[PDB]
Amino acid sequence: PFRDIYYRGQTSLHIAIERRCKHYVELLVAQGADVHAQARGRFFQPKDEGGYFYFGELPLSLA
Amino acid sequence: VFNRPILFDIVSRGSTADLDGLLSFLLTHKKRLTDEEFREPSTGKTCLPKALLNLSNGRNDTIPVLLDIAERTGNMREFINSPFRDIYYRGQTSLHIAIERRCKHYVELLVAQGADVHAQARGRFFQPKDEGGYFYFGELPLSLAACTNQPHIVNYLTENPHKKADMRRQDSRGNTVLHALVAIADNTRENTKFVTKMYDLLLLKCSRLFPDSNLETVLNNDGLSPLMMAAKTGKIGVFQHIIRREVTDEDTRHLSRKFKDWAYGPVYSSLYDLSSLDTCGEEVSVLEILVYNSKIENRHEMLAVEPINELLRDKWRKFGAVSFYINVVSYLCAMVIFTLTAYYQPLEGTPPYPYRTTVDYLRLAGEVITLFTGVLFFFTSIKDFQLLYFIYSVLVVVSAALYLAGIEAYLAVMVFALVLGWMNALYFTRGLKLTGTYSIMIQKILFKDLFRFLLVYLLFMIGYASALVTLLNPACRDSETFSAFLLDLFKLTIGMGDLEMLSSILLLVTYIILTFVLLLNMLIALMGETVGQVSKESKHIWKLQWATTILDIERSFPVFLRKAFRSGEMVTVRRWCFRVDEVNWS
């Protein structure tokens, strides 16, 4: 659970899925990664709300 | 031999038996191979030039055996180099010629034998196309190998086991290989591609050889720098690649102009390195050259390169809008104060110091504001389009001087100042409300209309007048000769009609018809030409005026005040970087 106003809630699972590799996603989730992650970061808000990339703030929506 | 031309023919034809017999009697007569006999009286061409110009499909493998004659002749140093004397060819050397013919074997032979790779061929034929020449390549053998799309020989000459012309070396023009490579750079696709590829190769090689200072830094006598030279001479083909230069090798990281800091999937925050597009008034920058110069042929597209356009937009949003609005509003309010002071100008003339009333005090305050703005404008003009501004400043100064003299009948200069300033008002308003078609309009029709009108109008007027005064020694007049009434009559005709004459002679009506139709169709043609030219200003002209306004504002207030573009890191990535955000789904 990050704390930056520039990155709030970003989780390792989001990052792993983002890098476009499924093996580490499988490892993390099998280990028990919280797939219900609400990454409510300013950088995650739509481009017209001061953010840079909005994807639904969910690991599945991010994939 | 007995005459040089037969020797020249023999060397051109590549014969050897007669040729080594020639060598034989040259040994017999103890004559140097560089004697006046072997050099033309005017051009001084040696055997080597003529032999190489006659290159037969690269089959000159024998004439090096001819060159072997040289050490037997005892004059080897001066023999290789060929300092021509023609004004049409000054300094051209055999090495230049050999490299030009697009063959590396003879270049290798010559250089290994000790060819002077530091050759400054300062020939008129070698000067740029706009200085009476025909081909400029930097006046250096290495720059000549480069400009002529010859990668292998620029590699070799920089890697030969002998003297290897250092890339850093500057010609008389000071250009160096980079400046020369951008000099012949064309905006066309093939020239652009080959020039940019070789430019990369060259800079990377020089960096590897000289990590201390990348070749970009070294300027010319003009001092522009390669990028600024590609900018000043409308070289978009190179420019657009110069801006976005990013390379791979770790030792070649510093020599890049577009880093990539972070990415989050489909979003890329590309960090352009505009370390030279804004010097904060220290030195010249690509923005100043690009916007404050008209010799550029590709301004509009050269203002579309990513960092320049985004940097203009950033300078606008951050500081351009506020300063521009303050400036325009202050100008309008101060000149409205001037106008009201003129309207409330003290009555009954004779204003020595007629202010003993509260409204009089307000008028004096307005006049003081007018004088303050006029003198400040004069200061800006002298410190510094500017034509009309200076005219306004001087007119305000003169009007103030005359008013302080307490003399009458000299408010006319004040009114002139007012009208000129409000004419400058449209120039300043060009930037407001996304306007500016009006400036284009003023610089489009103004001169043509007055030219044609004045001419044909006064002309048919005098033609009319000759016959009119022929009829009358009454209607147009009472007595005496004055073309003024005829001018008034023609104004009545063109604008008013209901024209009257003494006559109640037909060629007069012909004059009227011709002038009327000519003026009407002139207006039609002006409309057509204006609509053709503007084409909605191609959606670009206003952008150029906008950039002009932004840069003018930025230069106006001092830059030591910390109003600058984005900043960045300290080392290995102290480059005053700027950021840009773009999303791509590839």
From Swiss-Prot, chain A:
Modified how: N-glycosylated.
UniProt binding sites for a 1,2-diacyl-sn-glycero-3-phospho-(1D-myo-inositol-4,5-bisphosphate): 20-22
Subcellular location: Cell membrane; Apical cell membrane; Cell junction, Adherens junction; Cell projection, Cilium
Tissue-specific expression: Detected in liver, kidney, heart, brain cortex, cerebellum and brainstem (at protein level). Expressed in salivary glands (at protein level). Expressed in heart, lung, spleen, liver, kidney, brain, skeletal muscle and testis. In the central nervous system, expressed in the lamina terminalis (arched vascular organ and neurons of the subfornical organ), median preoptic area, ventral hippocampal commissure, and ependymal cells of the choroid plexus. In the cochlea, expressed in both inner and outer hair cells, and in marginal cells of the cochlear stria vascularis.
Result after altering residue 24 to F: Results are conflicting as to whether hypotonicity-dependent channel activity is abolished
Record's function text: Non-selective calcium permeant cation channel involved in osmotic sensitivity and mechanosensitivity. Activation by exposure to hypotonicity within the physiological range exhibits an outward rectification. Also activated by heat, low pH, citrate and phorbol esters. Increase of intracellular Ca(2+) potentiates currents. Channel activity seems to be regulated by a calmodulin-dependent mechanism with a negative feedback mechanism. Acts as a regulator of intracellular Ca(2+) in synoviocytes.
Assembly and oligomerization: Homotetramer. Interacts with calmodulin. Interacts with CTNNB1. The TRPV4 and CTNNB1 complex can interact with CDH1. Part of a complex containing MLC1, AQP4, HEPACAM and ATP1B1. Interacts with MAP7 and Src family Tyr protein kinases LYN, SRC, FYN, HCK, LCK and YES. Interacts with PACSIN1, PACSIN2 and PACSIN3 (via SH3 domain). Interacts with ITPR3. Interacts with AQP5; the interaction is probably indirect and regulates TRPV4 activation by hypotonicity. Interacts with ANO1. Interacts (via C-terminus) with PKD2 (via C-terminus).
Recorded domain comment: The ANK repeat region mediates interaction with Ca(2+)-calmodulin and ATP binding. The ANK repeat region mediates interaction with phosphatidylinositol-4,5-bisphosphate and related phosphatidylinositides.
Protein name in UniProt: Transient receptor potential cation channel subfamily V member 4
Source organism: Mus musculus (Mouse)
Gene from which the chain derives: Trpv4
Residues of the full protein shown: 230 to 292 of 871
